[PDB]
Amino acid sequence: TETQSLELAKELISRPSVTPDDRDCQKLMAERLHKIGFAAEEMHFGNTKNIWLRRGTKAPVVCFAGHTDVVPTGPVEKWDSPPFEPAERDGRLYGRGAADMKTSIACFVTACERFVAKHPNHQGSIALLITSDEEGDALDGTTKVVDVLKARDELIDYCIVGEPTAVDKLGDMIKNGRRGSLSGNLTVKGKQGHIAYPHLAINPVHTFAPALLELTQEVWDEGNEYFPPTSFQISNINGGTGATNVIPGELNVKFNFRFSTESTEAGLKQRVHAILDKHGVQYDLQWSCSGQPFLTQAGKLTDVARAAIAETCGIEAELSTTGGTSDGRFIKAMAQELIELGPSNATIHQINENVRLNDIPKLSAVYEGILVRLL
Amino acid sequence: TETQSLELAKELISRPSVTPDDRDCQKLMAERLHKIGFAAEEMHFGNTKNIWLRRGTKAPVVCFAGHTDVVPTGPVEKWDSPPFEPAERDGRLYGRGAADMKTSIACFVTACERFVAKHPNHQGSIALLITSDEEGDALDGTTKVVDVLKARDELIDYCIVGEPTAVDKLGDMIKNGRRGSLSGNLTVKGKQGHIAYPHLAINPVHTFAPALLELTQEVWDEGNEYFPPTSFQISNINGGTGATNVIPGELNVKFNFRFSTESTEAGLKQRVHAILDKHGVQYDLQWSCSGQPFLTQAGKLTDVARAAIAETCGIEAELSTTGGTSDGRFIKAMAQELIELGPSNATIHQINENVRLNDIPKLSAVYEGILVRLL
C-alpha cells in the first residue's frame, strides 16, 4: 500500500497539458527514471514532445506506452473542482487526466522503481514510449517515434499501453487489439426539379432508399473469438436546399465501418458498391481507411496480465477489442505482442473525470506483477 | 387578325411590376375598360393593389382572373434582351411576364372590346378580378377580394384564370382544378453517441430506414378521371453534426403530398403515422396544409373552352389538374365553375421568358369565343 503512485499522479495531473502541450511532464519523468538506470532520447517533431526512456540493451524488451496530453476541460466553472488541481473526494481522485491517462503513467513509473529495487539483475530491458500528442491529430507523436525505432531495428517484444480499459473494477478488462476503420463519403445523384413536377426530376432520397435499408440491415460478419461483428453506422445524411417545394439534385451520406479480422477493406467496399448498384443508384463514393484491425492473440503477454490481475485484484480479466483505438495501432507494427491495461474509462473526456483511489496502488502493483513475470 | 392584344401586352410587359408592386397596370386597365362600361372597385390591402372591374349587374357573371405581378428577373445581364423592354424576335415576344401572365391579361382586355362592340346587348355580366400579388405570399391579394365578394353574395358563374396552361401549342391544355398540398416536418429521435459504441446510441437514420423505404414505395391512390395519383416527395433530409465518428441524436425530414380528391388530408396523415409506428420509429411530426384539391368537372365552361379552342386553333384541348396551383384555389369558393387557360408555361419564371407571337391573337380570339358562348 505504497503512496507514491498517488503522489506522482497528482503532480502529473497538476500540469495543464492540453494537447499538444507537454508542460514538461516528460522532463520530470526523464529525471525521475534517470536515477534508476533509464536513459532518455527526446524525439520532438513540430510542436509535439515525444520521448523514449530505456533501461537495458537486450531482449526481451518490455515497453509501457502512454501520452501526457489531456483533452480540453471545457468551461472551467462547470467542474466541481478545478480540473488541474487534483482533488481527493469520496474515494476518488478528480482531475483532467485522472483516468486518461496520467494515473497509469504514474503507476508504471513507481512500478519500475519497486521492480528495479527488488530485481537489480533482471534480464532484458524496460522502456517507456511517451507522447504529448495522442488526443489530437497526432501526426507528430507516437507514429513518428515508431518510424525511428523500426528504422534502426530497435524492436519491442511486449508492450503495455496504459489507456484506461476497465469497465468498472480495475483489471476486469484488457484490450488486445482494435477494429480497423473504413469510411465512405457517398454522393447520390438525382436531378433537381420542382416538387410539383416529379416526372421531370430524380429524387436522390427516393433512389437511395432501398440501398439505405439494405445497408443498415446487412450483417457484415459473425465476429469471432476476439472481435464483435463488424459494425456499419451512418454518421451524417444531408440533401435539399431548405425549400420545401424542391426535389434535391443530390444527397450526401457519410458512413463508417469499425471492422474486425473477419472482413477485409476490399470485401466491404465491394459489398457496399454491389448493394448500391443492384438498386440502380447513381453516385460518386470516396473511401478513406484510417487503419486495419490489429490483434495480439492469447500468449505470454495476455497470460501474464491475467495472472498479475488475478493476484492483485482477485478477479478474472476479460480480453476485448471493442471501443475506439489508441497509439497501440502505431506501436503494434513494432511490438510482437501488445495489450492495453488501465483503470475505468467511464469518465474519460468528461467533466469531473476521476479514478478510484484504491485502484491506484493496485494498478501499479499489476504493472509490477507484469514486469516480474516477463523479466 | 388584330394587333391590339400584342400592343397591350408590350405596354404591360414594360412595367417592372415585381411583386407586389402593380406599377399602375390596374389603372391602365381600369381607364381603358371604363370606355366600354366597366366600373372599377379598388381593393387595396397593405402593399397589395387589387381591383374588381365589372360590366353588368346580372347573372350569368363571367370572370377573367389574373395577376399583374411578375417574379424577379435575376441579374439583368444574363437575359438576351432587357426583361422589362419587350422585344419581338424569332416569332416570339420576349420579356418578364410575357408568359406569366401579362399577355393573357392583354388578350382578355381586347376580347372584351371586340365582344362588347359586336354584342352590345349581351346578357349577363363580365368582370375582371386582378391582383398585384399572386407570386409572393399572397396574403393581401385575391383571397381578400374573394372574401369581400363572397360576404356580399356577389358570386361568379364562370371564371377563366389566365395563367399559362399550354404544354406547347396554344389551346392544347386547359386546367380544371389543382391538387391539394399537405406538408410534413418530421423529427426522428435517436440518441447521440460515439460511433465506436453503437450499443450506447440510437441511430435515427437506421431507425427511419424501413419507414423511409415504405413511404417512398407507397402507392397513395389510383388517380381518377381528372387527377393523376397523389404524389409523395421528400424535399429535405438532414442528420448529423458533421463529425464522421458521431451517431446523430436526431434526423429531420421534410416531405410533401400534392394530393388528389381520391385521398383526404386526414387519411394521408393517418397513413404516414401508421407506417412510422409499425416500424417503431420515435418522432415528432408537424403538419401544414396549404390547400385542398379543387375541381370543376366537365360542364358548360369546359365545353365552351373546348369549342372555342377547336374553332380558333383547330385542335382538341385536354383537361388537366397537374403542376402547381394558382389563385383559382381562392376563387373556386365563389365561382360555380372555374378553368385556367393561357399560353405555354414552358418559360415561366425563367430568363428569356416568352410567348409565340401568333399565339397572342389566337388567345384573344379564344377568350372572345368563350364570351360569345356563355353570354
Short mmCIF file of C-alpha atoms in Angstrom, two decimals, chain A residues 67 97-104 134-135 161-167 170 172-175 178 322 325-326 340-349 353-355 363 367, chain B residues 197:
data_model
loop_
_atom_site.label_atom_id
_atom_site.label_comp_id
_atom_site.label_asym_id
_atom_site.label_seq_id
_atom_site.Cartn_x
_atom_site.Cartn_y
_atom_site.Cartn_z
CA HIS A 67 0.52 10.05 -23.53
CA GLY A 97 -6.13 13.14 -16.97
CA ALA A 98 -7.06 11.23 -13.77
CA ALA A 99 -8.50 8.40 -15.93
CA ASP A 100 -6.90 9.22 -19.28
CA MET A 101 -4.16 8.65 -18.57
CA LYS A 102 -1.79 10.26 -16.06
CA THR A 103 -2.60 7.83 -13.24
CA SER A 104 -1.39 4.93 -15.43
CA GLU A 134 -2.25 11.16 -28.63
CA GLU A 135 -5.59 13.03 -28.27
CA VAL A 161 -0.28 0.84 -23.39
CA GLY A 162 -1.67 2.44 -20.20
CA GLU A 163 -5.02 3.61 -21.60
CA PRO A 164 -7.99 3.19 -19.27
CA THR A 165 -9.56 -0.14 -20.26
CA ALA A 166 -11.61 -1.17 -17.21
CA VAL A 167 -15.39 -1.27 -17.47
CA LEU A 170 -9.70 -2.38 -12.11
CA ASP A 172 -11.86 -6.60 -15.33
CA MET A 173 -10.90 -5.82 -18.94
CA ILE A 174 -7.72 -5.66 -21.00
CA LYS A 175 -7.59 -4.68 -24.71
CA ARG A 178 -8.74 -2.78 -32.06
CA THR A 322 -14.08 -3.00 -28.57
CA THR A 325 -8.49 2.89 -30.75
CA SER A 326 -5.19 4.17 -29.27
CA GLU A 340 -3.76 -2.01 -23.22
CA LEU A 341 -4.38 -2.00 -19.45
CA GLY A 342 -5.58 0.91 -17.29
CA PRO A 343 -8.37 1.99 -14.91
CA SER A 344 -12.02 2.58 -15.65
CA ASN A 345 -12.65 4.63 -18.83
CA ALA A 346 -16.21 5.63 -17.80
CA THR A 347 -15.35 9.34 -17.23
CA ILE A 348 -12.74 9.89 -19.90
CA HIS A 349 -13.07 13.20 -21.71
CA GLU A 353 -13.05 12.90 -14.69
CA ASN A 354 -11.82 10.59 -11.93
CA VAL A 355 -10.15 7.34 -10.83
CA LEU A 363 -2.72 -0.65 -10.91
CA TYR A 367 2.20 -3.39 -13.72
CA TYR B 197 -20.05 2.36 -29.21
#
